[PDB]
């Protein structure tokens, strides 16, 4: 939803500087994946924003 | 005292300029030949071509 900004030139976004807590929030969401996108091994992913670290 | 001084600020002019804001690379290979971009100069306002129906 943030990637929606910058329109077509949104691939220019390289990294997402964030705090440790958001990362754990995402990890928590990956541990309890609603849809089947994550597995025991794929839960821990630093690059989550379409390959953006 | 810095206050008692005369503060000057770096001034400069970038030699470049904004040129566009939309990805327009949509020609030939870019569109797998969907949109063709040729340099074909033709006379008149119409370039018609008749084919058997």
């Amino acid at each position: 939803a943030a990637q929606r900004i910058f329109g077509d030139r949104s691939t220019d976004i390289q990294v997402w500087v964030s705090h440790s807590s958001p990362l754990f929030d995402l990890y928590d969401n990956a541990l309890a994946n609603a849809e089947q996108l994550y597995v025991f091994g794929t839960v821990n992913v630093r690059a989550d924003a379409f390959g953006r670290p | 005292a810095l206050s008692d001084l005369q503060v000057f600020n770096d001034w400069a002019y970038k030699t470049m300029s904004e040129v566009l804001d939309q990805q327009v690379e949509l020609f030939n290979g870019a569109t797998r030949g969907a949109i063709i971009l040729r340099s074909a100069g033709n006379t008149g306002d119409l370039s018609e071509a008749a084919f058997w129906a």
Binding site: - | D10, Y13, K14, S17, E18, V19
Partner: protein, 53 residues
């Protein structure tokens, strides 16, 4: 940047066209100052415990 650089023209017409001007947007870089609080470092304390000051 020039907005209406490309304009639809009629080769069969001769009418006045609005004139465009060249603007100059300005970028800015603010300066930040940082310091260190006074650090009490007397040579007597270090020597008393055989430490090079």
């Amino acid at each position: 940047k020039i907005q209406g650089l490309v304009r639809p023209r009629d080769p069969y017409s001769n009418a006045d066209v609005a004139a465009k001007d060249l603007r100059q947007l300005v970028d800015n870089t603010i300066k930040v100052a940082s310091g260190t609080p006074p650090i009490n470092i007397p040579p007597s304390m270090l020597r008393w415990i055989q430490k090079n000051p």
